[PDB]
Amino acid sequence: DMYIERAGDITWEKDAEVTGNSPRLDVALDESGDFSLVE
Amino acid sequence: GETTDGVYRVMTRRLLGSTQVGVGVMQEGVFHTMWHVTKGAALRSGEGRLDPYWGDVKQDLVSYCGPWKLDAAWDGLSEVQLLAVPPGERAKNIQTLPGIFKTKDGDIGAVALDYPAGTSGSPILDKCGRVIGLYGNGVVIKNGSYVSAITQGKRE
Ligand SMILES: Cc1cnccc1NC(=O)c1cccc(-c2nccs2)c1
C-alpha cells in the first residue's frame, strides 16, 4: 500500500550545482513504454 | 489529505522498512507521477485517498484526483533543473543542458544524470519554475549511466 510525503516546493534555484552532458541518441519507444537504442 | 502544490515522495511498506519507489508532482489538486512507479494503484495521503484518473503505459504517465495539468515544454535551447528527490536524501536541484532523443515520431529532450530508480518521477523545471516533464523513463548507455527523456503529458 503506497503513500505520499511532501519533499519540497517546485522552484528554480540560482547557482544550483551544474552537471551532465547533452547526448544526441537515436531511440525507439515500444508499446510497453520502454525506450531502446537504435544503431 | 495533503493537497499543497509541490514535489512528493512515493513510499511503500510492502518491502523491508519504508521504501521509496518514486516521486511525483502535486499541482492544482492533481498528483502527477510515472506509470512504472505506482502501476496505476491507489495512494494514501494521511487518512485521505488518491484514486487514479488518467494513465497511459506507453507515455509511462499517470494522474490522480483529476486530468493531467502540466503543459510546459523544453524550449529546445536553455539549461533546465532536475529537482531530484533521491531515496532518504533531501530534494536537490541539478542544472543540465538536455540532449535529444531522436525517434520516428519526433525529437524529445533528454537529461544525462545518474540517480537510483526510486528517483523516477522527479520533475524537470524551466527558468520560470514550470514543470516541463518528469525524470525516470529512458535508456542505459555504454557508460552504465542512465539518460532519461523529459517525459511530459497533454493538458486538455
Ligand atoms: C523501472 C522502470 C520501468 N519501466 C520503465 C523505466 C524504468 N526506470 C528505470 O529502470 C530507471 C529509472 C531511473 C534511473 C535508472 C538508472 N539509473 C542508473 C542506472 S539505471 C533506471
Side-chain angles (χ1 to χ4, degrees):
Chain A
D1 192 73
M2 290 185 174
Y3 63 95
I4 63 170
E5 281 172 354
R6 200 153 185 289
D9 289 4
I10 293 161
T11 79
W12 186 278
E13 292 297 311
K14 286 162 161 139
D15 305 76
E17 187 194 336
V18 180
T19 199
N21 71 307
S22 302
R24 293 170 188 277
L25 296 170
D26 292 320
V27 312
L29 179 57
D30 74 9
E31 183 180 87
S32 309
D34 302 314
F35 285 106
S36 58
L37 283 168
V38 174
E39 298 268 36
Chain B
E2 187 168 24
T3 332
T4 312
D5 285 4
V7 63
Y8 288 64
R9 304 177 189 268
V10 183
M11 308 294 307
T12 186
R13 297 216 201 73
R14 215 186 41 88
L15 271 39
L16 193 77
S18 296
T19 302
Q20 181 177 306
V21 291
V23 181
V25 175
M26 189 72 68
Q27 184 162 132
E28 283 158 83
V30 167
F31 192 67
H32 310 62
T33 193
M34 313 215 83
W35 191 92
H36 80 255
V37 168
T38 67
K39 315 282 190 240
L43 304 168
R44 180 160 37 85
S45 176
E47 276 178 328
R49 196 183 162 127
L50 299 205
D51 301 313
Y53 186 96
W54 171 82
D56 185 315
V57 152
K58 197 179 170 170
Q59 299 179 47
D60 187 40
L61 292 182
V62 57
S63 73
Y64 292 78
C65 291
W68 190 268
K69 301 291 178 177
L70 314 184
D71 53 355
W74 186 39
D75 61 10
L77 283 182
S78 318
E79 277 189 9
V80 308
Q81 294 188 349
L82 172 67
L83 176 8
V85 188
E89 314 175 346
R90 189 152 51 256
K92 180 209 25 180
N93 299 58
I94 311 272
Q95 173 169 324
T96 196
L97 182 76
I100 303 286
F101 271 8
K102 287 156 188 179
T103 86
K104 42 168 263 274
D105 297 326
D107 283 357
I108 324 192
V111 295
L113 297 176
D114 294 356
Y115 282 107
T119 312
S120 281
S122 295
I124 300 152
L125 309 188
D126 66 0
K127 274 152 172 185
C128 283
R130 276 179 308 151
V131 181
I132 55 159
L134 298 192
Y135 164 94
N137 204 24
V139 99
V140 166
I141 56 177
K142 38 280 333 290
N143 316 16
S145 196
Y146 207 77
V147 183
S148 175
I150 311 173
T151 318
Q152 188 55 294
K154 203 181 133 215
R155 199 195 160 103
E156 308 270 316

